[PDB]
Design brief:
Chains A, B: This is DUF4015 domain-containing protein. Two copies of one chain form a homodimer. Chain A has 190 residues and is of the alpha/beta class. The first copy, chain A, contains seven helices and seven strands; from the N terminus they run βααβααβαβαββαβ.
Chain lengths: 190, 190
């Protein structure tokens, strides 16, 4: 029904507002950020790789947010931004999209992105999903399952861009058995 | 976005209710059915193939509904159910999923489905989408882009189920240039 940031749900006034709204209207589900495009998990993570590079913030208390929503019969979809991650791709530059001039490619906002071809980022993203499911998210929604928008350089292993993203989503499916996953195919078929 | 049936937006009181809701809240979009899983287009269609088999109903006045939503800055996603179509698959049985025993396959509710492998259904669905775009839908959301859940018979041409669906989505992409399309990949990556 509505997309809510981690900051929004981390406000008790705002959390109660969205509970009241769902209780008095047809709304019965929210999308809440797990990891937004800033590259930070929005609650305290216990995942060693996340804690090691500081890729989490106290935007909200995930246990309290999920309990409040569940108590009121509201479905909670966790939004997990994938390759638009300027934290992991800068903390671990081997994982970043490379420039033809060498070094990490930067977009018009001076940000680095993850290279989908580098499968070493995949377990990191999936572990974030797994932890979110353990906390209680009802569904995982993957966003930015794409390359950035002549100066990028890739080692493709002979796979087209749509094929490597499809491989990533198959990996996610295999690693998250029994979990409701969602993602837009027209972020892939372009 | 909240999901609205055709019948719902075809009621003037209900339409106004949902306008009021969007105006007073964070809601800025609705999904409205173009073609639901009953196999009828929810407004009067002028597509010859749709008219020929009676596959439309006056659930709502599409021009009035889109005008009212647009006048209020609400984005309207048109939902287009693809292969769960018991009307086209019964009226044109060559297009139906076949049974191994004989005849058209029927599900647990006694309904026939369209066979994704039969490409002669594809232009019918795309023409519905083209017509909705012409009326003013802002985005097309394809649903039931899947086979039904040992009794179905197919002529696959050597293609797997996920491959023929991707072919269908590629056809939609090519035939609907510049249109915002959406569909859930995990209705295809199983």
């Amino acid at each position: 029904a509505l997309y809510l940031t981690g900051w929004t749900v981390g406000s008790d006034e705002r959390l109660q507002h969205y509970v009241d709204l769902a209780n008095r209207t047809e709304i019965n589900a929210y999308v809440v950020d797990i990891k937004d495009d800033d590259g930070y998990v929005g609650y305290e993570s216990n995942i060693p790789a996340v804690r090691e590079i500081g890729a989490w913030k106290s935007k909200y208390n995930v246990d309290k947010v999920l309990k409040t929503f569940h108590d009121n019969n509201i479905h909670v979809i966790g939004r997990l931004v994938c390759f638009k991650d300027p934290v992991l791709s800068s903390k671990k530059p081997e994982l970043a999209v490379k420039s033809v001039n060498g070094g990490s490619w930067r977009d018009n906002h001076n940000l680095t992105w993850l290279d989908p071809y580098n499968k070493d980022s995949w377990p990191y993203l999936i572990e974030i999903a797994k932890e979110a499911v353990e906390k209680g998210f009802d569904e995982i929604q993957f966003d930015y399952i794409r390359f950035p928008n002549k100066s990028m350089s890739f080692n493709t292993g002979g796979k087209e861009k749509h094929e490597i993203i499809n491989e990533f989503l198959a990996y996610a499916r295999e690693q998250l058995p029994g979990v409701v996953l969602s993602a837009d195919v027209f972020g892939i078929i372009l």
